[PDB]
Amino acid sequence: SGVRNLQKQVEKVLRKSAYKIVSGEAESVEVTPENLQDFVGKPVFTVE
Amino acid sequence: ELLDPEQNANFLDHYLDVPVDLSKVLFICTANVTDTIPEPLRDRMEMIN
CA distance B22 to B6: 10
Closest by CA to B35, choosing from B27, B44, B47, is: B47
Beta-bridged to residue B20, according to DSSP, are B11
b (16+ CB within 10 A) / e for B2-21 = eeeeeebeeeeeeeeeeeee
Q: How many CB atoms lie within 10 A of CB A28?
A: 7
User: Which of A33, A7, A31 has its CA nearest to residue A21?
Assistant: A31
Angle between helix axes A4-22 and A33-40 (nearest 10 degrees) is 90
State the nearest Cα–Cα gap between A9 and chain B, in angstroms. Answer: 8
Resolution (A): 12.0
List of E strands, chain A: none
Distance CA A28, CA A35 (A): 14
| Sign of the CA dihedral with B42 first, then B6, B24, and A22 last | positive
Q: How far is CA B11 from the centre of its chain?
A: 11
Contact yes or no for A5 and B44 at CB 8 A: no
DSSP state for residue B19 in the 8-state scheme: P
Which residue among A4, A5, A12 places its CB closest to the CB of B46? A12
Cβ of B44 and A8 within 8 Å?
A: yes
- Technique employed here was cryo-EM
3-state secondary structure of B3: coil
Task: For residue A4, give every residue at least 6 positions away whose Cβ sits within 8 Å of its Cβ, in sequence order, or none.
Answer: B40, B43
Between the alpha carbon of residue A11 and those of residues A48, B12, B19, B39, the distances in Å are: 25, 24, 25, 17
Name chain B contacts of A11, Cβ cutoff 8 Å. 5, 44
